[PDB]
Design a protein around this ligand. Structure first.
Ligand SMILES: *[C@@H]1O[C@H](CO)[C@@H](O[C@@H]2O[C@H](CO)[C@@H](O)[C@H](O)[C@H]2NC(C)=O)[C@H](O)[C@H]1NC(C)=O
Ligand SMILES: *[C@@H]1O[C@H](CO)[C@@H](O[C@@H]2O[C@H](CO)[C@@H](O)[C@H](O)[C@H]2NC(C)=O)[C@H](O)[C@H]1NC(C)=O
Ligand SMILES: *[C@@H]1O[C@H](CO)[C@@H](O)[C@H](O)[C@H]1NC(C)=O
Lengths: 621, 15
């Protein structure tokens, strides 16, 4: 199954741009959505920078380096793109040794024109925008001062002098911590937490003896040292710190740490490292209040305090997560949960693959997925798992079949129903991407030699076709596309083979003439999610309700468009004893589902799991 | 240290 006469259609829609400059490093930023503005910041070493801007989704670039008047730019901070569609860009330059303060070039019209200003300080961290109003900024100077600007960098005012860390809250509220004696390092565990809703006109103290703090959605977390030991607990507040309540989590020591893996408006995933350097921890899941925590998974993988973990939220399907556990022999394995952490199991084996050497039972093995950790160990894993919210039930990732993550060269596997079933898509490492909300997928081979071919499929990784886009192969470096997976333009970077003097290059391909027609009512089928056993009266009812999507058929070759929005039709299910969790003074006996009592606020009975929308039936207070 | 806040992505970089 293949379409014909696509070679000419793709040939007409191909644009090459070559950058004449020394090969240093590159940085790519997208300014807004639906504008097609791309800013490329080239740097080389001494100090020298070049700035390019494209207003056509990357088909053509212009040299606007003279706007910033040929001044070296600090790439450590990076470009500070404004939130949403505001087109605010701020750059930080390098100043001489006798400078009073730093210097920034600021634009508010999608980088059409830049304005130069001199700061009264030396910013030591990237500028931060207020989510509710982009005109506000804050930064920390080298002397740990806190400077806040209310007119987009025109003027700044110092509102404190010993700030360790700061960050915008909600509704233009600022939370920051301060120290008194010594630096912020030697004074750890004896800090204070401050809040100010008037942009530093009136302050307030909301905590003491703090060890760290952070924002996890509609929660405020602060790790407080114990009064007489080195053990530190977790305190959580949801009133902007007005009132705090102790969380029901173990008190870790000084050699351990916490870590938020994913924080919604209702649930939060917490990781608690076990004592010792064994290299694993545990996962707890909270309730709607963010106070009561129940154990979810054990022997979770976490390299170190600054290390990496394989936890992954599958955005395509509701309540699906994937993570790596640690076995008894230190052999990593992959687990998946569909109940938002209720149960974990192995990934289903592909129905048409053979187990590798890692599997002792040649008729019994499972699929395992490479992730951040595998990339850390320097394996052949060009990319991590990919998934888009607007492409329903699609997941792509490298993996191997067996009883443990192997070290051989991995293949690529794809699932088109959320993760229940998989199948081998390509052989060998690749760089993959999704365009037009799952309309067309593209892939580039991962090789050590120049490549001049790109593959693409229109039936969700079923039929693949090869297009030769360049006559001169280039060393591939990466793919770029508009965030959100709703465009049809794809940019292919790299650098030419020129041995005497190499150069950068980019090829942009537009698939407007491949998807000639626009999808209609007929080009859609009704699909039920989480369906396992049709016999069930409430088949595929997760967290109390079902959902019936309308998904584009694989055979249908058509364009969803930029205005496509997924369709759904939820229906609730009767409640049961499995929709509730335990309260402070109760626990689940083993081999049963009831919540009995264990051998200040008070609780009576059970609690309804966050995200659950069932109604009717069993209701144990 | 404790990672109590989600770290959003950065910027695409090459070399
Ligand atoms: C896992 O990812 C999914 C998909 O991005 C998240 O679902 C979204 O959650 C936000 C925040 O509450 C909602 O505004 C969206 O409507 C959700 N989109 C859906 C369900 O398609 C989900 O929150 C993430 N999970 C966690 C625990 O962070
Ligand atoms: C891919 O890039 C092209 C330009 O190369 C985008 O074209 C824009 O299309 C919109 C919607 O019709 C027009 O209003 C704009 O004027 C076009 N831009 C230009 C510079 O002319 C195209 O939209 C991109 N792909 C998708 C799927 O939108
Ligand atoms: C541009 O930079 C040069 C560097 O020598 C400086 O002399 C000049 O004043 C700058 N121009 C403007 C308009 O700021």
């Amino acid at each position: 199954g293949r379409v014909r006469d696509f070679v000419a259609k793709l040939a007409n829609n191909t644009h090459q741009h070559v950058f004449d400059d020394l090969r240093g490093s590159v940085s790519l930023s997208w300014v807004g959505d639906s504008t097609g503005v791309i800013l490329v910041l080239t740097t080389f070493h001494f100090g020298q920078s070049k700035l390019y801007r494209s207003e056509d989704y990357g088909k053509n670039f212009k040299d606007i380096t003279d706007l910033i008047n040929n001044t070296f730019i600090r790439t450590e901070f990076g470009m500070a793109i404004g939130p949403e569609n505001s087109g605010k860009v701020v750059l930080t330059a390098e100043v001489s040794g006798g400078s009073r303060g730093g210097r920034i070039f600021r634009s508010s019209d999608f980088a059409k024109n830049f304005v130069q200003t001199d700061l009264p300080f030396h910013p030591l961290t990237q500028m931060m925008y207020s989510p509710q109003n982009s005109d506000y900024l804050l930064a920390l100077s080298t002397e740990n001062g806190l400077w806040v600007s209310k007119n987009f960098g025109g003027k700044w005012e110092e509102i404190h002098k010993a700030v360790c860390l700061a960050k915008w809250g909600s509704d233009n509220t600022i939370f920051f911590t301060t120290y008194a004696n010594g630096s912020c390092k030697a004074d750890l565990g004896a800090l204070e937490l401050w809040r100010t809703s008037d942009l530093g006109k009136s302050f307030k103290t909301i905590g003491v003896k703090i060890y760290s703090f952070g924002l996890g959605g509609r929660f405020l977390f602060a790790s407080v040292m114990a009064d007489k030991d080195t053990t530190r607990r977790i305190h959580v507040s949801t009133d902007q710190g007005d009132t705090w309540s102790m969380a029901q989590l173990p008190s870790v020591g000084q050699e351990q740490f916490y870590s938020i893996l994913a924080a919604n408006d209702d649930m939060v995933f917490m990781h608690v490292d076990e004592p010792g350097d064994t290299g694993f921890g545990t996962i707890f899941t909270s309730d709607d209040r963010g106070i009561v925590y129940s154990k979810s998974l054990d022997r979770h993988l976490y390299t170190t305090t600054g290390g990496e973990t394989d936890f992954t939220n599958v955005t395509s399907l509701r309540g699906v997560y994937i993570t790596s556990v640690l076995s008894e022999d230190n052999s990593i394995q992959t687990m998946i949960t569909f109940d938002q952490g209720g149960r974990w199991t192995h990934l289903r084996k592909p129905e048409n693959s053979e187990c590798d050497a890692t599997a002792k039972n040649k008729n019994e093995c499972s699929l395992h997925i490479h992730a951040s950790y595998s990339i850390s160990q320097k394996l052949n894993v060009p990319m991590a798992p990919l998934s888009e919210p607007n492409a329903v039930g699609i997941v792509i990732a490298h993996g191997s079949v067996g009883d443990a993550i192997s070290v051989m060269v991995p293949d690529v596997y794809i699932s088109d129903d959320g993760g229940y079933s998989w199948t081998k898509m390509l052989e060998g490492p690749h760089y993959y991407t999704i365009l037009d909300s799952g309309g067309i997928i593209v892939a580039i081979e991962h090789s050590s030699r120049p490549i001049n071919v790109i593959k693409f499929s229109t039936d969700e990784g079923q039929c693949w076709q090869t297009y030769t886009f360049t006559r001169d192969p280039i060393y591939f470096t990466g793919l770029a596309s508009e965030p959100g997976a709703r465009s049809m333009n794809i940019s292919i970077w790299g650098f030419t083979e020129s041995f005497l003097t190499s150069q950068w290059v980019s090829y942009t391909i537009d698939f407007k003439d491949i998807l000639e027609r626009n999808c209609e009512e007929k080009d859609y089928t009704i699909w039920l999610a989480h369906s396992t056993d049709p016999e069930d009266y409430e088949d595929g009812c997760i967290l109390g309700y079902k959902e019936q999507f309308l998904r584009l058929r694989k055979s249908s070759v058509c364009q969803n468009g930029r205005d496509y929005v997924v369709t759904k039709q939820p229906s609730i299910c009767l409640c049961s004893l499995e929709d509730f969790l335990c309260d402070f003074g109760y626990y689940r006996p083993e081999n049963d589902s009831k919540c009995v009592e264990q051998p200040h606020l008070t609780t009576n009975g059970y609690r309804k799991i966050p995200g659950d929308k069932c109604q009717g039936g069993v209701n144990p207070v | 240290e404790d990672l109590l806040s989600l770290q959003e992505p950065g910027s695409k970089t090459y070399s």
